[PDB]
Ligand binder design. Structure first.
Ligand code: HEC
Ligand SMILES: [N]
Length: 114
């Protein structure tokens, strides 16, 4: 949860994201504490959209495990809500980051965006 260390991780994320504009992925400023799938202007996959509609909020404790495996996290979230029938298919332009500390740190950095 070292935000400054997270800034360096965020350079990897900038392959697809920016803070303040949509790119391959949605803009991330304000993502922490926000309903999943609700960045203005961005067309989400069914899986990413349905997860937010089912009540997924991007708290730090949700973002960190998500970053290791977006598809598996979102499917598990929906399945535990009794909504496996909304979990069919996969996300867009999928990226995984294995390193846990890097995930924790970048998530602290995301909170600094707003
Ligand atoms: C392109 C290969 C990506 C890289 C590198 C990273 N992300 Fe990403 N992310 C990408 C897309 C195309 C999407 C939307 C997928 C969909 O199916 O609609 C996302 C989504 C996120 C989210 C969820 C945002 C929301 O619900 O509003 C988060 C929190 C996120 N991405 C974070 C993130 C970080 C921190 C990354 C670096 C470790 C990162 N992503 C890389 C595409 C890509
Ligand atoms: N992502």
């Amino acid at each position: 949860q070292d935000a400054k260390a997270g800034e360096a991780v965020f350079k990897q994320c900038m392959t697809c994201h920016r803070a303040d504009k949509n790119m391959v992925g949605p803009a991330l400023a304000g993502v922490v504490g926000r309903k999943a799938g609700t960045a203005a202007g961005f067309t989400y996959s069914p899986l990413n959209h349905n997860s937010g509609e089912a009540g997924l909020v991007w708290t730090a404790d949700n973002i960190v495990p998500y970053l290791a495996d977006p598809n598996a996290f979102l499917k598990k979230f929906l399945t535990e809500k009794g909504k496996a029938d909304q979990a069919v298919g996969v996300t867009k332009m999928t990226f995984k980051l294995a390193n846990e500390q890097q995930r924790k740190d970048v998530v602290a950095y995301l909170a600094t965006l707003k």
